[PDB]
Amino acid sequence: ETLVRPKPELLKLLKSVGAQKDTYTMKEVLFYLGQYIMTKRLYDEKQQHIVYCSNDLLGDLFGVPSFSVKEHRKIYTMIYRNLVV
């Protein structure tokens, strides 16, 4: 599996929920990001595919006030904007 490299801001985000390395598989990046969103309770209690990130670092990194977990292609685009090319 291909190893990818987070930029400094994303890296600090992943290391806040136990991540220990400088490079990751994409399944690992998606693991730590999910643990972040769910630990901080950013998902809507009632409509659990929708994430509110307006007052969070994640909103600054992704450039949105919210997104939907159904939009797979859009989540991948937003993650790849935050990886070293």
């Binding site: 598989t25 399944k27 998606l30 999910g34 969103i37 769910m38 659990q48 977990v69």
Partner: peptide, 14 residues
């Protein structure tokens, strides 16, 4: 679904 079940669907695309 639960947040966990929607989020699992992304693992698939990886």
């Amino acid at each position: 679904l639960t947040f966990d079940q929607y989020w699992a669907q992304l693992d698939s695309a990886a």
